Write a protein that binds this DNA or RNA. Structure first.
Ligand SMILES: Nc1ncnc2c1ncn2[C@@H]1O[C@H](C[C@@H](N)CC[C@H](N)C(=O)O)[C@@H](O)[C@H]1O
Lengths: 156, 157
RNA sequence: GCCGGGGUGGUGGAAUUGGCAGACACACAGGACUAAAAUCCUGCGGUAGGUGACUACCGUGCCGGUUCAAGUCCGGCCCUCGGCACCA
């Protein structure tokens, strides 16, 4: 019911951790195929430990292919640019598929896409001591915020 | 009046580095219960590229009891998979109290007897069933931002 | 000065009465593992033929000798440590 999209990830271990977090929440992981690693990177495998068999991982050769395939979806885009924190939105409809899309670790999301949908742009309130926050951590804050709103349904 | 993340004998280096990242992005004081499984020497801190350590405000403690007796009136929430309550069932809004979030060991976990005595404040992030545990990094960050959700991201841009 | 130890890979270092030199540990390297500076598995003296299987070759401070065979025994020398002597 929940989805995590990774636009061309770079760090294998970051993605592997997110896969484990997905298996702990029964979340679908989406990957935009211009990846910075291979499918056989051993750091990818390690970060996912043994939980890989419980992750439904979907590959998409482009951001477009994903959007069209999941035409009925609440696509939430997570960048520094959004003027609204992630907790100011609503994820409480359980009859829906919620999509959280994460940019490249050293780039962002496509600047065209951010322009068109700034109402769905979630910025995690930080300080100035760091420029960003680890993707695998940032992915988890949103899954367990949305899971709070859905009252961790079926999850004990 | 801020949040406090204390890590009981952390071992895997990368987890603690990512926790310090979140701690610097939230101005959350990081308490470190020794023995640690790594080295926080400035040489090794810079070998891992941890340039935010200066802003993390790390308070090394040598025992869990030392930490309890230095911050006696801290609200100590112990975070383990053996809790029965979520992390969102408690109130971290009081800006007059010091809230402390205790995390465990990546290969072992929090002291079992400490969990038994204080099951009232034992928080379990709801997982599936086939997943034994979450990442220490992820578990810490989730808790920091849930308290900041309740604290409306005080002085956070 | 005498006597007695030590010298051996990248490192500390092992090798019994002469009979496969480098055990073992650290380093390193490749992996595995219930995000490793944890742990576990594997490789590791050199050379060249080598895809490799591996092979032969060389290698214990220098130079000798005894041996079928010398890290090992013998003689000279270099370096080093210790006891003893040596000190107007
Ligand atoms: N589901 C979870 N709920 C709460 N804390 C967790 C969870 N998974 C991991 N943690 C944190 O990470 C620590 C270590 C675990 N990752 C490892 C398994 C260990 N047996 C345990 O006590 O959970 C825990 O002691 C917590 O600090």
């Amino acid at each position: 019911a929940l989805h995590v999209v990774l636009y061309q990830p770079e760090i294998p271990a970051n993605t592997g951790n997110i896969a484990r977090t997905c298996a702990a929440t029964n979340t679908t992981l989406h990957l935009i195929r211009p990846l910075g690693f291979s499918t056989d990177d051993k750091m990818l495998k390690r970060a996912g430990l043994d939980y890989w068999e419980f992750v439904n991982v979907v590959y998409h050769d482009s951001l477009e292919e994903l959007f069209e395939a999941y035409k009925k979806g609440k696509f939430f885009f997570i960048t520094k640019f959004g003027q609204q924190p992630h907790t100011s939105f609503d994820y409480t409809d359980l009859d829906e598929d919620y999509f959280f899309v994460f940019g490249r670790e050293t780039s962002g999301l496509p600047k065209d896409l951010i322009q068109n949908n700034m109402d769905r742009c979630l910025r995690l309130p930080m300080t100035e001591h760091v420029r960003s926050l680890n993707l695998s951590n940032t992915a988890a804050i949103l899954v367990y915020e949305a899971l709070r709103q859905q009252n961790y349904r079926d999850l004990k």
